[PDB]
Protein backbone atom coordinates (compact mmCIF):
# COMPACT_ATOMS: atom_id res chain seq x y z
CA UNK A 1 0.00 0.00 0.00
CA UNK A 2 3.06 2.37 -0.21
CA UNK A 3 4.93 3.24 -3.42
CA UNK A 4 8.22 1.25 -3.58
CA UNK A 5 11.17 0.19 -5.75
CA UNK A 6 10.44 -3.55 -5.83
CA UNK A 7 12.72 -6.39 -6.98
CA UNK A 8 11.16 -9.88 -6.93
CA UNK A 9 13.29 -12.64 -8.54
CA UNK A 10 15.17 -9.85 -10.44
CA UNK A 11 11.90 -8.33 -11.83
CA UNK A 12 13.02 -4.80 -10.91
CA UNK A 13 10.04 -2.43 -11.03
CA UNK A 14 8.33 0.48 -9.24
CA UNK A 15 4.76 1.08 -8.02
CA UNK A 16 2.34 0.41 -5.16
CA UNK A 17 1.96 -3.26 -4.20
CA UNK A 18 -1.53 -4.45 -3.18
CA UNK A 19 -3.22 -7.74 -2.18
CA UNK A 20 -4.58 -9.44 -5.36
CA UNK A 21 -7.71 -11.61 -5.69
CA UNK A 22 -6.15 -13.17 -8.89
CA UNK A 23 -6.30 -17.01 -8.70
CA UNK A 24 -2.88 -17.94 -10.21
CA UNK A 25 -2.21 -21.65 -10.89
CA UNK A 26 0.81 -23.31 -9.12
CA UNK A 27 3.23 -23.09 -12.10
CA UNK A 28 2.92 -19.27 -12.63
CA UNK A 29 5.26 -16.67 -10.98
CA UNK A 30 4.32 -13.44 -12.89
CA UNK A 31 1.04 -12.14 -14.34
CA UNK A 32 0.71 -9.72 -17.19
CA UNK A 33 -1.90 -7.25 -18.35
CA UNK A 34 -3.42 -6.48 -21.81
CA UNK A 35 -0.41 -4.13 -22.22
CA UNK A 36 2.09 -7.10 -22.00
CA UNK A 37 3.65 -5.76 -18.73
CA UNK A 38 3.84 -7.50 -15.32
CA UNK A 39 0.75 -6.33 -13.32
CA UNK A 40 0.76 -9.13 -10.68
CA UNK A 41 3.41 -11.28 -8.93
CA UNK A 42 3.67 -14.33 -6.61
CA UNK A 43 5.95 -13.48 -3.65
CA UNK A 44 8.75 -16.12 -3.61
CA UNK A 45 8.87 -16.51 0.23
CA UNK A 46 5.16 -16.59 1.13
CA UNK A 47 3.25 -17.64 -1.97
CA UNK A 48 0.48 -14.93 -1.99
Amino acid sequence: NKCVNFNFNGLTGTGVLTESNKKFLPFQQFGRDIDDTTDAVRDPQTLE
Binding site: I34, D35, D36, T37
Partner: protein, 48 residues
Amino acid sequence: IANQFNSAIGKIQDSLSSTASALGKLQDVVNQNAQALNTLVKQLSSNF
Protein backbone atom coordinates in the same frame (compact mmCIF):
# COMPACT_ATOMS: atom_id res chain seq x y z
CA ILE B 1 -49.99 18.67 -38.12
CA ALA B 2 -49.51 18.33 -34.35
CA ASN B 3 -50.50 14.63 -34.52
CA GLN B 4 -47.98 14.01 -37.34
CA PHE B 5 -45.22 15.78 -35.36
CA ASN B 6 -46.19 13.81 -32.19
CA SER B 7 -46.18 10.54 -34.20
CA ALA B 8 -42.82 11.31 -35.88
CA ILE B 9 -41.19 12.01 -32.46
CA GLY B 10 -42.69 8.65 -31.37
CA LYS B 11 -40.75 6.96 -34.24
CA ILE B 12 -37.53 8.71 -33.08
CA GLN B 13 -37.90 7.00 -29.65
CA ASP B 14 -38.52 3.62 -31.35
CA SER B 15 -35.55 3.97 -33.77
CA LEU B 16 -32.99 5.06 -31.14
CA SER B 17 -34.16 2.20 -28.87
CA SER B 18 -34.43 -0.57 -31.52
CA THR B 19 -31.00 -0.50 -33.32
CA ALA B 20 -27.38 -0.24 -32.11
CA SER B 21 -26.52 1.08 -35.64
CA ALA B 22 -28.28 4.44 -35.02
CA LEU B 23 -25.32 6.31 -33.40
CA GLY B 24 -22.65 4.58 -35.54
CA LYS B 25 -21.05 7.94 -36.56
CA LEU B 26 -20.26 8.65 -32.85
CA GLN B 27 -19.30 5.07 -31.94
CA ASP B 28 -16.81 5.00 -34.90
CA VAL B 29 -14.97 8.02 -33.34
CA VAL B 30 -14.81 6.38 -29.89
CA ASN B 31 -13.64 3.13 -31.55
CA GLN B 32 -10.88 4.80 -33.66
CA ASN B 33 -9.51 6.75 -30.64
CA ALA B 34 -9.64 3.55 -28.53
CA GLN B 35 -7.88 1.63 -31.32
CA ALA B 36 -5.18 4.30 -31.71
CA LEU B 37 -4.51 4.29 -27.92
CA ASN B 38 -4.56 0.48 -27.70
CA THR B 39 -2.05 0.30 -30.60
CA LEU B 40 0.17 2.98 -28.97
CA VAL B 41 0.29 0.91 -25.74
CA LYS B 42 1.02 -2.36 -27.62
CA GLN B 43 4.13 -0.71 -29.18
CA LEU B 44 5.64 -0.76 -25.63
CA SER B 45 5.76 -4.60 -25.97
CA SER B 46 7.80 -4.46 -29.24
CA ASN B 47 11.56 -5.28 -29.13
CA PHE B 48 12.74 -2.86 -31.87
